[PDB]
Design an enzyme around this catalytic site. Structure first.
Site, mmCIF file in Angstrom:
data_model
loop_
_atom_site.group_PDB
_atom_site.id
_atom_site.type_symbol
_atom_site.label_atom_id
_atom_site.label_comp_id
_atom_site.label_asym_id
_atom_site.label_seq_id
_atom_site.Cartn_x
_atom_site.Cartn_y
_atom_site.Cartn_z
ATOM 1 C CG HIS A 41 28.947 4.607 -0.033
ATOM 2 N ND1 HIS A 41 28.416 5.454 -0.547
ATOM 3 C CD2 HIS A 41 28.174 4.500 1.121
ATOM 4 C CE1 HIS A 41 27.546 6.454 0.292
ATOM 5 N NE2 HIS A 41 27.321 5.816 0.755
ATOM 6 N N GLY A 143 23.687 13.604 0.316
ATOM 7 C CA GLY A 143 24.436 14.578 1.369
ATOM 8 C C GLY A 143 25.222 14.154 2.430
ATOM 9 C CB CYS A 145 26.501 8.917 2.769
ATOM 10 S SG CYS A 145 25.526 8.564 1.917
HETATM 11 C C1 LIG Z 1 23.686 7.554 -2.661
HETATM 12 N N1 LIG Z 1 23.432 7.690 -1.195
HETATM 13 C C2 LIG Z 1 22.881 6.657 -1.133
HETATM 14 C C3 LIG Z 1 21.290 6.917 -0.299
HETATM 15 O O1 LIG Z 1 20.970 5.850 0.402
HETATM 16 N N2 LIG Z 1 22.121 8.477 0.877
HETATM 17 C C4 LIG Z 1 21.684 8.470 1.056
HETATM 18 C C5 LIG Z 1 21.484 8.816 2.879
HETATM 19 N N3 LIG Z 1 20.451 9.467 4.180
HETATM 20 C C6 LIG Z 1 19.282 9.712 3.409
HETATM 21 C C7 LIG Z 1 19.092 9.229 2.424
HETATM 22 C C8 LIG Z 1 17.709 10.515 2.017
HETATM 23 C C9 LIG Z 1 17.547 10.984 0.421
HETATM 24 C C10 LIG Z 1 18.319 10.492 -0.076
HETATM 25 C C11 LIG Z 1 19.530 9.419 -0.600
HETATM 26 C C12 LIG Z 1 20.016 9.784 1.117
HETATM 27 C C13 LIG Z 1 23.340 5.333 -1.152
HETATM 28 C C14 LIG Z 1 22.103 4.595 -1.953
HETATM 29 C C15 LIG Z 1 22.300 2.872 -2.284
HETATM 30 C C16 LIG Z 1 23.666 1.879 -1.842
HETATM 31 CL CL1 LIG Z 1 23.576 0.829 -1.256
HETATM 32 C C17 LIG Z 1 23.963 3.499 -0.512
HETATM 33 CL CL2 LIG Z 1 25.879 2.067 0.100
HETATM 34 C C18 LIG Z 1 23.547 4.768 -0.394
#
Ligand SMILES: CN[C@H](C(=O)Nc1cncc2ccccc12)c1ccc(Cl)c(Cl)c1
Ligand SMILES: CN[C@H](C(=O)Nc1cncc2ccccc12)c1ccc(Cl)c(Cl)c1
Lengths: 300, 305
Positions: A41, A143, A145
């Site tokens: 992603h 951040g 991920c």
């Molecule tokens: C922008 N990345 C976000 C995501 O969930 N990112 C986070 C990962 N861990 C904790 C978080 C806490 C607060 C905010 C974001 C967090 C995201 C959103 C939807 C999809 Cl389908 C995917 Cl693959 C990734």
């Protein structure tokens, strides 16, 4: 003596954490040999998130779109490919700190250490279990991920998880290091929900054995139970059913403490019916389910 | 989201762990520059420990009596000296993996990460607090002596603890890296007992702020209290008194959540007198006291090392 939630030493994994930037998105990458692994992603913008075609988006990317940074040194991306939900960036430098490693896919109930990172920099290490609903109850911010879950076998790092997203309830979803998600999750912003989580019964039993090894005995009783009678009670409390495999796995702890598995099962049944009566087990007022039988043997 | 007991990344400390053997005793050593630090009881047998004259025992030792091993390489000891309860072995080679470091002595309530080791090999990392009774509720087996406690501040490792022994209750005692014990403990095989432990009040308050940041807010109430009224109630439940320093340290969390410290104290006061009513906070049925205010800010803001 003592019993703690213990993570593996994270040093071998820290030497692999890098920062991966694609356009405006920055996340973590795992640099092993001349390959940097990260969630696919990272190639997504705002428009291509609800229903992205990753194969199509990656075909439009060039090696110069990916910015990889290891410490204060930029790595040169000489290739890119996708394996399921993981992006693989070939770089022109092999990581000199690459440990002995394997990619392993774990089952629900299995535990692992998480090295939480931000901008390729390790910030903390904690211990997790793969929940029966295939989510992990982590501690992650935006951040994070690309942060990885792992276990260490002597000198070998077994990478078992890469963090991809946070679900609406605050729990986390990710994949193994081959990009296959744990659970029925997709790396799309589509409506997703974790199933109702349950307690890892075999882990609670292993933790009760750890408590006995540490001198806690108040919860023991003179009862035994059948595996079927135990499962019928356990399930009414949202506990996972205990299989014959779980009874066999608890064998060494049973031999060490002199308490048969079905005898410990009857103690668990009583704890569920009574509660703790103001008492604690290993300094906890709830039954702990994030220590596997192997974790208990290793720590004790 | 989420809140976990989280230790600092242990990599900078792993590169310093070595095995120290003296006679039949093998324990862990901390190799920094050309010095290996380890508990001074490594020079004792079971008989020596009963009434040890360490100054006398060390004078009888030669550099070749100490066997230091870093990985599968043996280090040559070219000197030895004792600083309080720590033995310092000068070696001919400076540790090339020596990080930026300091030796710091911590106060009760402060938290740190423990890198548990056996035979100079790191086996696990965990976060714990220096209890008000100066023990740590660690997890250590035989051979773990010499395992160290540390914090990381920017890119600097602050070593604050070295493991020496396990008390009869299963709790642990050790020293700072200058060999001074935390608590009224001695490194002699004699009857020793930890004092009655108390709860780290400032840490419970920080953890309640972490729960509010995570959306767990059933325990909040409309009430506030004076610091004096709070301490009188807290003293009765074996909670450490809260000072004005603690109130100031909780300031950023009070500003972030919109809950004043004395307002959170009134929530804690009710939790102490009435219990949780079958409810949990951050998935716990007990009040957690091993997260400092700084730990909560660090975890709920993603500071890296
Ligand atoms: C922008 N990345 C976000 C995501 O969930 N990112 C986070 C990962 N861990 C904790 C978080 C806490 C607060 C905010 C974001 C967090 C995201 C959103 C939807 C999809 Cl389908 C995917 Cl693959 C990734
Ligand atoms: C050989 N060291 C032991 C000791 O307590 N060693 C241990 C340290 N940590 C955990 C242990 C768990 C189980 C068994 C031993 C453990 C010892 C005995 C008495 C004194 Cl006064 C001192 Cl300084 C040292």
């Amino acid at each position: 003596s003592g019993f703690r939630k213990m993570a593996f030493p994270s040093g071998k994994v820290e030497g692999c954490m890098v920062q991966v930037t694609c356009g405006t998105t920055t996340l973590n990458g795992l640099w092993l040999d001349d390959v940097v692994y990260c969630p696919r992603h990272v190639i997504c913008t705002s428009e291509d998130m609800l229903n992205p075609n990753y194969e199509d988006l990656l075909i439009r990317k060039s090696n110069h779109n990916f910015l990889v940074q290891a410490g204060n040194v930029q790595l040169r991306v000489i290739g890119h490919s996708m394996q399921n939900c993981v992006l693989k960036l070939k770089v022109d430098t092999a990581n000199p700190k690459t440990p002995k490693y394997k990619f392993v896919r774990i089952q629900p109930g299995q535990t692992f250490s998480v090295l939480a990172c931000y901008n390729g920099s390790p910030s903390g290490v904690y211990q997790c279990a793969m929940r029966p609903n295939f989510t992990i109850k982590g501690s992650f911010l935006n951040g994070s991920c690309g942060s990885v879950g792992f276990n260490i076998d002597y000198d070998c790092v077994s990478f078992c998880y890469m963090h991809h997203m946070e679900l609406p309830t605050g729990v986390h979803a990710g994949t193994d290091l081959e990009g296959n998600f744990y659970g029925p999750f997709v790396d799309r912003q589509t409506a997703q929900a974790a199933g109702t989580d349950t307690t890892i019964t075999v882990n609670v039993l292993a933790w009760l054995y750890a408590a006995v090894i540490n001198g806690d005995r108040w919860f023991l009783n003179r009862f035994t139970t059948t595996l079927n009678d135990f499962n019928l009670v356990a399930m009414k409390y949202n506990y996972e059913p205990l299989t014959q495999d779980h009874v066999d796995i608890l064998g060494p702890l049973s031999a060490q403490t002199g308490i048969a598995v079905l005898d410990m099962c009857a103690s668990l049944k009583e704890l569920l019916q009574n509660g703790m009566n103001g008492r604690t087990i290993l300094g906890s007022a709830l039954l702990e389910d994030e220590f596997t039988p192997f974790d208990v043997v290793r720590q004790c």
